[PDB]
Every structure is written in C-alpha cells, then in structure tokens.
Design a protein around this ligand. Structure first.
Ligand SMILES: *[C@@H]1O[C@H](CO)[C@@H](O[C@@H]2O[C@H](CO)[C@@H](O[C@@H]3O[C@H](CO[C@H]4O[C@H](CO[C@H]5O[C@H](CO)[C@@H](O)[C@H](O)[C@@H]5O)[C@@H](O)[C@H](O[C@H]5O[C@H](CO)[C@@H](O)[C@H](O)[C@@H]5O)[C@@H]4O)[C@@H](O)[C@H](O[C@H]4O[C@H](CO[C@H]5O[C@H](CO)[C@@H](O)[C@H](O)[C@@H]5O)[C@@H](O)[C@H](O)[C@@H]4O[C@H]4O[C@H](CO)[C@@H](O)[C@H](O)[C@@H]4O[C@H]4O[C@H](CO)[C@@H](O)[C@H](O)[C@@H]4O)[C@@H]3O)[C@H](O)[C@H]2NC(C)=O)[C@H](O)[C@H]1NC(C)=O
Ligand SMILES: *[C@@H]1O[C@H](CO)[C@@H](O[C@@H]2O[C@H](CO)[C@@H](O[C@@H]3O[C@H](CO[C@H]4O[C@H](CO)[C@@H](O)[C@H](O)[C@@H]4O)[C@@H](O)[C@H](O[C@H]4O[C@H](CO)[C@@H](O)[C@H](O)[C@@H]4O[C@H]4O[C@H](CO)[C@@H](O)[C@H](O)[C@@H]4O[C@H]4O[C@H](CO)[C@@H](O)[C@H](O)[C@@H]4O)[C@@H]3O)[C@H](O)[C@H]2NC(C)=O)[C@H](O)[C@H]1NC(C)=O
Ligand SMILES: OC[C@H]1O[C@@H](O[C@H]2[C@@H](OC[C@H]3O[C@@H](O[C@H]4[C@H](O)[C@@H](O)[C@H](O)O[C@@H]4CO)[C@H](O)[C@@H](O)[C@@H]3O[C@@H]3O[C@H](CO[C@H]4OC[C@@H](O)[C@H](O)[C@H]4O)[C@@H](O[C@@H]4O[C@H](CO[C@H]5OC[C@@H](O)[C@H](O)[C@H]5O)[C@@H](O)[C@H](O)[C@H]4O)[C@H](O)[C@H]3O)OC[C@@H](O)[C@@H]2O)[C@H](O)[C@@H](O)[C@H]1O
Ligand SMILES: *[C@@H]1O[C@H](CO)[C@@H](O[C@@H]2O[C@H](CO)[C@@H](O[C@@H]3O[C@H](CO)[C@@H](O)[C@H](O)[C@@H]3O)[C@H](O)[C@H]2NC(C)=O)[C@H](O)[C@H]1NC(C)=O
Ligand SMILES: *[C@@H]1O[C@H](CO)[C@@H](O)[C@H](O)[C@H]1NC(C)=O
Ligand SMILES: *[C@@H]1O[C@H](CO)[C@@H](O)[C@H](O)[C@H]1NC(C)=O
Ligand SMILES: *[C@@H]1O[C@H](CO)[C@@H](O)[C@H](O)[C@H]1NC(C)=O
Ligand SMILES: *[C@@H]1O[C@H](CO)[C@@H](O)[C@H](O)[C@H]1NC(C)=O
Ligand SMILES: OC[C@H]1O[C@@H](O)[C@H](O)[C@@H](O)[C@@H]1O
Ligand SMILES: *[C@H]1O[C@H](CO)[C@@H](O)[C@H](O)[C@@H]1O
Ligand SMILES: [Mg+2]
Length: 550
C-alpha cells in the first residue's frame, strides 16, 4: 500500500540485535497517560538523545501508549493523526542522531488488550489491535532499517490458553504491518511472549508459521523480585546462589531459543531504591550474563532512575559505564551478600555515626585483576596515594587523620563528598561519605482511624542518607502484619514489608500506604512499624518506631 521513494538498507535480525547493544528506554514519556507530560517527565526534547548517544548507547527503545489517542472506536479505531506524527517525529529525533529505534504498543497491554480479564472481548481486542498496527505501520512504513517494531509490551498471560492468545498477538501484528506495505516486509521486528517473562515465553511462545520479516525475541528481566523491588527487607545482592539464580534464568531462555536473536528490552536495579554496591554487582553480572548468552540489553529509565534530561547528568554513572563498555572488566566495591549475617556492610560507603570518634575505615573491593590508579573527590581533590589511602590486597584503607578532614564527632549528618576511584580499566566506582545518626519522626504513634482514607505521610528528620531501607511490621501479639513467609529471610528480612506496596518515602516524609493502614485495622491490633535506614549495622540502632493503634 504505502509507497516509499528512497532506498532501504536491509539488515538481518542478528545484525540489528548486535548493533543496538546497549539500549536505553525513553520511559514514562510517550507511554505516559493520557499525554506524554502526564507523568514525571516534561515534553520530550531532542537534547535528551544527544545525552544518550554521548553516554555510549547504540539504541533507544521508544515505548508508546496508544490507549488515549484514538479519535474513533469500532470499527476503524482511528488514531489521532497528530499522535502518529509525534511518534514519527521522535523516531526521527532518535535515528537522525545515529541511534537505532524500537517502538511498540505499551500500556495498551493492560489498559484494553488484556486477555486474562474475565469480561474481555477478544474479538474487539484483536480487531482494534490489527487496526492500530495497520495505522502505525502505515505512518512508519518508510522508516529506515534502523527502526524496528515490537508487538506489545508485557502482555498479561497466566495460562497456556492465554499463551496461544499472545502468539495470535504476534501474528495479527505481522499481518497488519505487512499489509501496510512500504518497507515493513523487510523490517526487523520484536516478537513477545507472555508478560515478556523468560519462563512464560519459553513455555508458550511459538514462531508465527511462515514468518518472513527478520525477527528477534524480546523479553524483560526484573529478577530477583526481592532485590529489584525492595521486597521483604532484601537490601543485598551478590551471593553465589544469587548469581546462579540469575544465570539459570537467562540460560534456560536461551536454551529454548538456540538460534534466535534475543533482545533484553528492559532491566533496572534502580538507583532510587537499591543499595549501590549490590546494584553495581547486579548490573555487572547481568551484563556478563547477556554476553554469555548473546543477548542485547536495554536499560529501563523512567526519567528519575538514571538520566536527568534537563542537565545531561546521569544519576548513577557507574552503572552506565558498566552497561556501555561490556568488553571491560570492572573492579567493584564489596558488600555483605549473606542473608543470615547480623550486620550489613557496603564498600560503596564510608559511614560515620554522629557522636562517635573518627577511625580508620578499611573498604574491601573486588579488584578483578585491575590495579587502582587514582582517587578523586567530588570537589576535585585527587587523594595522595599512600597518605590519604593505602591498598593492601583487596583492601583500601582510609586513615582517621584523612577522614577527619571531611567529618568530625559532632559534624552535621547528611551526604558529604564522594570519592571516584579510577582503575586500570572498567567502570570507576563511587564511594559515598555519609555522616549518619538515628532519624527522628514528628509522630511516634497514631490511631488507625484518625489517619485513614489515604497514604500516611509521617514527617521525618533524615540523618545521613535520605533513603528508607525497609519497614518492619509486627502485630502486638507477635504475628507479622503481612507475608508470613519472611520468617525464613534472616535477621534483616523477617517481618519486613515491600516498597511501594506497603511503604515509601519522599524529601520530607516516610510513608505507609493506605493498604498498610487498612491491614492494621483488619488485624484489629496495635502494630509497630520499624523504619530502617542505612547503614543497617544491626536490626535496632539505626531505626525508628511508629505505632499504629486500634
Ligand atoms: C521498636 O519497638 C520494638 C517493639 O516494641 C522494640 O523491640 C523490643 O525491644 C525491647 C528492649 O530492647 C526488647 O526487650 C528485650 O527482650 C528480650 C526477650 O526477647 C525475646 O522474647 C520476646 C518476647 O516473646 C514473647 O512474644 C512472642 C510473640 O511471638 C512469643 O513467641 C514468645 O513466647 C513470648 O510470649 C520476643 O518479642 C523477642 O523477639 C524479638 O527479637 C527477636 C530477636 O531476638 C526477633 O527475631 C523478633 O522478630 C523480635 O524482634 C525475643 O524473642 C529479653 O531478653 C530482654 O530482657 C532483658 O533485657 C532487659 C533490658 O536490658 C537492657 O537494659 C538494661 C538497663 O536497664 C541493661 O541492664 C541490659 O544489659 C540491657 O542493656 C532487662 O531489663 C531484662 O531484665 C533482661 O535482662 C537480662 O538479659 C540481658 C541481656 O542478656 C542482661 O544484660 C541482663 O543482665 C539480664 O540477664 C539475666 O536475666 C536473663 C533473664 O532472666 C537470663 O537469661 C540471664 O542469664 C541473666 O541472668 C528484654 O525484655 C523486646 O524483645 C523487643 N521487642 C520486639 C518485638 O522486637 C525496639 O527496641 C524499638 N526500637 C527502637 C529503636 O525504639
Ligand atoms: C557524588 O556526589 C555529588 C555531589 O557533589 C553528586 O552529584 C549530584 O548528583 C545529583 C543527582 O545526580 C544532582 O542533582 C540533579 O541536579 C540537576 C541540576 O543540575 C545542574 O544544576 C546544578 C546547580 O543547581 C549543578 O550543580 C549541576 O552540575 C547542573 O548544572 C537537576 O536537574 C536534577 O533534578 C532532577 O532530578 C531529581 C532527582 O534526582 C528530581 O527530584 C528533580 O525534580 C529533577 O527531576 C525532575 O525533572 C526531570 C526533567 O529533567 C524529570 O525527568 C523528572 O521526572 C522530574 O520532573 C519533575 O520536575 C519537573 C520540573 O523540573 C517537572 O517538569 C515534572 O513534571 C516533574 O514534576 C537533580 O537534582 C546534582 O546536581 C549533583 N551535584 C553536583 C555538584 O554534581 C553525585 O550524585 C554523587 N555520586 C554518586 C554516584 O553518589
Ligand atoms: O522475577 C520473575 C520470576 O519470579 C519468580 O517468582 C519468584 C518471585 O515472585 C514474585 C511475586 O511474588 C509474589 O509473592 C508470593 C511469593 O512469590 C511466594 O514466595 C509466597 O509464598 O507467596 C507470595 C504471595 O502469595 C508477589 O505477590 C508478586 O507480586 C510477585 O510478582 C511480582 O509482581 C509485581 C507486581 O504485580 C502486580 O500485578 C499482579 C499481582 O500479582 C501483584 O500483586 C501486583 O502488585 C510485578 O511487577 C510488575 O513488573 C513489571 C515488569 O516485570 C515484567 O518483566 C519481566 C517478567 O519476569 C515479569 O513477569 C513481568 O511482569 C512492571 O513493568 C510493572 O510495572 C510491575 O507491575 C513483578 O513483575 C512480579 O515479579 O519472587 C519470590 C519467589 O517466591 C518466587 O519464586 C517466578 O517463579 C519466575 O518464573 C519468574 O517469573
Ligand atoms: C526451556 O524452558 C523451560 C521453562 O523454563 C525449562 O524447564 C524448566 O526447567 C527447570 C530447571 O531445569 C525446572 O525447575 C525444576 O523443577 C523441579 C520441580 O518442578 C525442582 O526439583 C527443581 O528445583 C527446579 O525448580 C522447571 O520445572 C522446568 N519447567 C518445565 C515446564 O519443564 C527448560 O529446561 C528449558 N530448556 C532448555 C533446553 O534450556
Ligand atoms: C465484542 O466486540 C465485537 C466487535 O466490536 C462486537 O461486535 C460485539 O458486540 C462485542 N460484544 C459485546 C458483548 O459487546
Ligand atoms: C505455511 O506455508 C505452507 C506452504 O509451504 C502452507 O501450506 C501452510 O499452510 C502454511 N502454514 C500455516 C500454518 O498456515
Ligand atoms: C583486609 O581487611 C580485613 C578487615 O580489616 C582484614 O582482616 C584482612 O586481613 C585484610 N587483608 C589484607 C590482605 O590486608
Ligand atoms: C494475633 O492476632 C491476629 C490478628 O488479630 C490473629 O490472626 C493471630 O492468630 C494472632 N496470633 C497470636 C499468636 O496471637
Ligand atoms: O512516578 C511517576 C509515575 O510513575 C508511573 O509508573 C505511575 O503510573 C504514575 O502515576 C506516576 O506519576
Ligand atoms: C559491615 O559488615 C562487615 C562484616 O559483614 C564489617 O567488615 C564492616 O566493618 C561492617 O560491620
Ligand atoms: Mg514498566
């Protein structure tokens, strides 16, 4: 149908997948609802993609939510021509800077295309979905080979019967875009399995019979759930069994798709909620695994996770170096990975409590055969080797005389300068000086029936790192408020609750969600909430209690 005037440099799906490594998501933008500035990001501007290219990414994934841009319903399901034009212009912002693109159908997946809901009209879902990709395929028919199409984001899928419906999603998609013509018959596509989960995909994905597009599989990876989602008090990552769990997940997917190009379309241990040493060990090992199993990774970034689009600053430059220079071996700060350990340490920090003396701090590092070249603080000062710090094996020691030029027994708590360590190769990790103390809350108790309706914001005086580590929740009689099974999760996991589901924080508050409050009212029992902070030196010192009464 569509007729393109120029030429099209055909590329195989293997080469496309090889050429996009690594990618970066334009998250919470064209996927935001109803408009691209409806969530946390402003209107997309082109300089964003300059920062992305400058950082070493070779591609951008471009999630688009179409739900709120239809100007007619059945049977045409016309998409707003201004929206199609906005998607097309932003793709042109990406490609014109030499970056590959992958554009999809995003939150439509659960907003209207959910086949697991008991009332879903599968006929209407299939018809609207065909019409949608016919229109996107028409608008984007003449894009270069650097533009690929992804079926649909994480489609909900619980059973084999649902898995057959996700396969049909891939088939309806291929038929629509080939019918739209232009260059689409030779365009690289990304096909999807249930939830974009490695296991559901392995179980139920079937290659569309007689497919003729060059095609790659895409999945998403947010495992392990406890670390990545900050659930049940998990604040560490890197044991031998954590590594084997991760390598097993990627290898069993590759094992089911031996000769198929595989895109890892989203992953992120976000700097917002995860501990940095565990975060950098996780990203390092994930990148190592994607190279082992020949997968191209694309990091998720919602605008607040990594790149600050208004300044070009990446909030976590160590992860970006790890993801963008995959042929280099990284020296990393060590950290506690033992879930039975009664104390948690991290070499991404130099911690010092208010009211304690200044002492030498030895930080164990994983050198990985790199040597340390230099250390420079965030004011520009290069540290004097063998005076401001000394190296012994994997240890880096900072003498008390040097550390006391940054803090004292009585200095104010908060974030101090950090140290950037330059090694022979690989990422340059960051050690963060934190002067900490036990935080205080404006309220120590409250009646459940007086704070109700909404989330409970409790104003807090942060003393050190302005981040919450987890929240313990115990009923008065000793029963856990939620999730019994955390009794098997060690001193720092027993009775702990989950980020966003149960607890949250902001600049001025710690937060207990409305569902946490309603869970106390239902239990009918006073519940003690122990807010816990970094360093997790033990289970009690660096914590503060709030009691919800009944
Ligand atoms: C936020 O709020 C929370 C909740 O309110 C606060 O946590 C609470 O902190 C307090 C204070 O620290 C804890 O009290 C201590 O608890 C000890 C018993 O704990 C164990 O049992 C309880 C009770 O279980 C009942 O309920 C459960 C429900 O399921 C049932 O299963 C069970 O059958 C019972 O019915 C459990 O709740 C508790 O579990 C917690 O901890 C475990 C880990 O251990 C976790 O896994 C759980 O999730 C849970 O968190 C646990 O199993 C008890 O030993 C202890 O009594 C001693 O200490 C008192 C205080 O001593 C300090 O202060 C003194 C100054 O006055 C100093 O002298 C002292 O050295 C110390 O600094 C003493 O007053 C008391 O006499 C006891 O002293 C004895 O032991 C000391 C230590 O060994 C010695 O120094 C003493 O000399 C003395 O030893 C002598 O006597 C003993 C006994 O006779 C002999 O054994 C010994 O040989 C010797 O002769 C104290 O009561 C409380 O447990 C805890 N609650 C919870 C739910 O966590 C939290 O602090 C707060 N945080 C903040 C920051 O504000
Ligand atoms: C080691 O230590 C050093 C300390 O020396 C650490 O360096 C600091 O790192 C910070 C985090 O990376 C960084 O903070 C950012 O600064 C930006 C401003 O930078 C420029 O100005 C300052 C002077 O003020 C200069 O110093 C600096 O060099 C630059 O010139 C801000 O742009 C950033 O704010 C955004 O992020 C924070 C969270 O990180 C948000 O709270 C904040 O609201 C901003 O995010 C909004 O805006 C973006 C759009 O850009 C949206 O995508 C996002 O959703 C948010 O949107 C809301 O708000 C907008 C309004 O803007 C609205 O449109 C929208 O609807 C939403 O409501 C950020 O604050 C420090 O500058 C940096 N300091 C220095 C000296 O370098 C370093 O991290 C340490 N390293 C490690 C590894 O620990
Ligand atoms: O990590 C994938 C991997 O997980 C294995 O399962 C292990 C993992 O379980 C996570 C789930 O735990 C449930 O709690 C269970 C617990 O697992 C049991 O141990 C215990 O006995 O019972 C507990 C409860 O009875 C939690 O209830 C679940 O919430 C959790 O799954 C995660 O759910 C969140 C949020 O889900 C919401 O919607 C549905 C509903 O279930 C839930 O209540 C709601 O809050 C998901 O967040 C979404 O994440 C996507 C991105 O993730 C996508 O990308 C890659 C795929 O792997 C994902 O499947 C896919 O969803 C994001 O875009 C959305 O915005 C978020 O809403 C998480 O994705 C879910 O992981 O941890 C502990 C262990 O016990 C389990 O064995 C599983 O077996 C593997 O096959 C593999 O899938
Ligand atoms: C292709 O992918 C499938 C789906 O992931 C892989 O099959 C799965 O293999 C794992 C590990 O071999 C099985 O888990 C094990 O199961 C038993 C009880 O279920 C337990 O003793 C073990 O601790 C472990 O959890 C899993 O059940 C199995 N699933 C299915 C449907 O067979 C398969 O291995 C992959 N194929 C290749 C060639 O990589
Ligand atoms: C389901 O969708 C089809 C196609 O739009 C329509 O003909 C049918 O009436 C719908 N079913 C119901 C119960 O609304
Ligand atoms: C695929 O192509 C063959 C022709 O070689 C055709 O006979 C067959 O029906 C097609 N498969 C399906 C599942 O329609
Ligand atoms: C490294 O530090 C630990 C803890 O201080 C110490 O026990 C160990 O002997 C040190 N190792 C070397 C090689 O200096
Ligand atoms: C504690 O109270 C809860 C809620 O009131 C109840 O379900 C549970 O059985 C009680 N357990 C004990 C040990 O008292
Ligand atoms: O926090 C930024 C945004 O995140 C999204 O995941 C939520 O759905 C939005 O409601 C929220 O504004
Ligand atoms: C954190 O934990 C480790 C041991 O796990 C210590 O070496 C460190 O000093 C801190 O207590
Ligand atoms: Mg998402």
């Amino acid at each position: 149908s569509a007729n393109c005037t120029g030429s099209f440099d055909a590329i195989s799906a293997s080469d496309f997948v090889a050429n996009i490594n690594p990618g970066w998501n334009l998250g919470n933008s064209l996927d935001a609802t109803p408009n691209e500035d409806s969530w946390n990001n402003p209107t997309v501007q082109e300089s964003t993609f300059d920062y992305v290219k400058a950082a070493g990414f070779k591609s951008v994934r471009l999630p688009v939510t179409w739900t709120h841009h239809f100007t007619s319903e059945s049977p045409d399901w016309t998409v707003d021509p201004k929206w199609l034009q906005r998607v097309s212009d932003v793709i042109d912002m990406i490609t014109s800077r030499g970056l590959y693109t992958i554009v999809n159908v995003h939150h439509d997946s659960w907003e209207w295309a959910d086949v697991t809901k008991s009332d879903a009209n599968i006929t209407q879902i299939e018809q609207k979905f065909e019409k949608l990709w016919y229109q996107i395929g028409t608008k984007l028919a003449c894009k270069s080979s650097m533009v690929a199409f992804e079926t649909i984001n994480e489609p909900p899928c619980n059973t084999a019967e649902d898995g057959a419906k996700i396969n049909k999603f891939n088939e309806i998609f291929l038929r629509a875009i080939n019918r739209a013509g232009g260059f689409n018959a030779k365009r690289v596509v990304n096909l999807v399995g249930g939830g974009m989960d490695s296991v559901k995909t392995s179980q139920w994905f079937k290659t569309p019979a007689n497919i003729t597009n060059p095609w790659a599989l895409q999945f998403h990876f947010y495992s392990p759930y406890d670390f990545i989602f900050s659930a049940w008090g998990k604040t560490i990552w890197g044991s031998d069994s954590d590594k084997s769990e991760l390598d097993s997940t990627l290898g069993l997917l590759r094992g089911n798709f031996t000769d198929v190009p595989i895109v890892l379309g989203e992953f992120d241990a976000s700097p917002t909620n995860t501990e940095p040493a565990a975060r950098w060990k996780y990203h390092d090992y994930l990148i190592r695994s994607t190279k082992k199993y020949n997968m191209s990774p694309i990091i998720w970034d919602n605008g607040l996770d990594h790149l600050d689009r208004s300044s070009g600053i990446w909030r976590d430059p160590v992860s970006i170096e790890i993801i963008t220079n995959g042929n280099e071996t990284n020296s990393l700060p060590d950290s506690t990975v033992d879930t039975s350990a009664p104390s948690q340490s991290s070499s991404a920090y130099i911690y010092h409590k208010v009211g304690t003396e200044v002492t030498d701090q030895t930080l164990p590092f994983i050198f990985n055969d790199n040597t340390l070249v230099s250390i420079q603080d965030s004011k520009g000062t290069t540290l004097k080797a063998d005076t401001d710090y000394t190296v012994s094996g994997s240890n880096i020691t900072f003498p008390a005389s040097f550390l006391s030029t940054y803090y004292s027994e009585t200095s104010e708590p908060g974030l101090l300068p950090n140290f950037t360590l330059k090694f022979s190769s690989g990422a340059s990790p960051v050690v963060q000086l934190v002067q900490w103390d036990t935080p205080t809350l404006s309220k120590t108790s409250a009646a459940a029936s007086s704070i109700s309706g909404s989330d409970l914001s409790i104003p807090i005086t942060w003393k050190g790192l302005p981040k919450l580590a987890t929240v313990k929740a115990l009923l008065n009689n000793g029963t856990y408020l939620v999730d019994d099974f955390t009794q098997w999760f060690g001193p720092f996991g027993e009775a702990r609750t989950t980020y966003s589901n149960q607890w949250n924080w902001d600049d001025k508050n710690v937060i207990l969600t409305q569902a946490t409050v309603e869970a106390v009212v239902a239990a009918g029992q006073d519940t003690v909430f122990t807010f816990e902070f970094f360093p997790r030196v033990d289970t009690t010192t660096n914590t503060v209690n709030f009691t919800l009464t009944v």
